[PDB]
Design a protein around this ligand. Structure first.
Ligand SMILES: [Ca+2]
Ligand SMILES: [Cu+2]
Length: 290
């Protein structure tokens, strides 16, 4: 397509344009948060470690599915589980159109021998050119005049992995703008909407155990699978289509003997590959040039 998924703003709500944080590194679970340096990959040849939730990339626990209507046959694109926006981890970078870079994600050195990670990513372009403060959204509706440090808005709490992502019906904004280098006929700057433009996405499809399976759609994401023979890591060449500000989401795909979702939306599994101590696995994200 790619598909475009268009959300309706509601606050409080799932599609409330919540803030994400570029420093938070700790896994999901009952534990208090830990923060590290902000994940800014600008200039490239940079690398940061953080934890990602067990099923975060393709996540039945979200209770939310989308349909990719660009797929033929239509049925092959229906009932796609979303990812979880906040049990994955966010990063950003500034770059130039034509920059040829390499994105690699693998297990952090501290968990290098512990099986569990199958990292996946989504890369978005934000034509606005930088962090987008939007008054009246979930975390900016108490008189804030700017984003909190090292933070940015994204559309909602559950995320689509192979689509342009649009939010409309936002509290009207008079300074939703983009730099002059942006064609606002192709990339409109509306007073009540914004779009995170799909650039690329993919996940580590190399299984630790050949007999097992991934918690992953049977057909909708066949083009997203990355196979390099190494379980727990992927690497991919990306040529930036545009100059400006990019937002990168990384999250996990779980490997199991079997998995199921019951009528109450409860996820059950057996034979999980999950040897790490926490409810999230530690990975290192690197963007290299070349
Ligand atoms: Ca791999
Ligand atoms: Cu969330």
């Amino acid at each position: 397509g790619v598909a475009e998924v268009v959300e309706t703003f509601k606050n409080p709500g799932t599609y409330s344009s919540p803030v994400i944080n570029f420093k938070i590194a700790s896994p999901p679970g009952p534990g208090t948060p830990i923060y590290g340096p902000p994940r800014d990959f600008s200039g490239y040849n940079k690398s940061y470690s953080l934890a990602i939730g067990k099923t975060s990339y393709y996540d039945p626990t979200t209770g939310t599915k989308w349909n990719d209507d660009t797929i033929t046959p239509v049925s092959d694109g229906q009932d796609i589980w979303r990812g979880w926006t906040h049990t994955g981890k966010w990063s950003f970078f500034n770059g130039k159109a034509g920059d040829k870079i390499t994105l690699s994600v693998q297990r952090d050195a501290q968990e290098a021998s512990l099986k569990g990670a199958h990292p996946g990513f989504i890369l978005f372009w934000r034509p606005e050119g930088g962090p987008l403060f939007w008054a009246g959204t979930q975390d900016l509706d108490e008189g804030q005049t700017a984003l909190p440090a090292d933070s940015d808005t994204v559309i909602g709490h559950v995320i689509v992995q192979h689509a342009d992502w649009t939010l409309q019906g936002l509290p009207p904004k008079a300074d939703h703008t983009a730099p002059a280098g942006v064609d606002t006929e192709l990339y409109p700057m509306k007073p009540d909407s914004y779009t995170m433009y799909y650039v690329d996405s993919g996940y580590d499809a190399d299984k630790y155990v050949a007999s097992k399976k991934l918690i992953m759609h049977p057909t909708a994401f066949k083009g997203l699978a990355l196979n390099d023979g190494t379980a727990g890591a992927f690497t991919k060449s990306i040529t930036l289509p545009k100059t400006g500000y990019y937002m990168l989401y990384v999250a996990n795909v779980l490997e199991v003997d079997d998995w199921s979702v019951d009528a109450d939306g409860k996820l059950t599994t057996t034979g999980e590959v999950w040897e790490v101590p926490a409810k999230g696995c530690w990975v290192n994200i690197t963007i290299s040039k070349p």
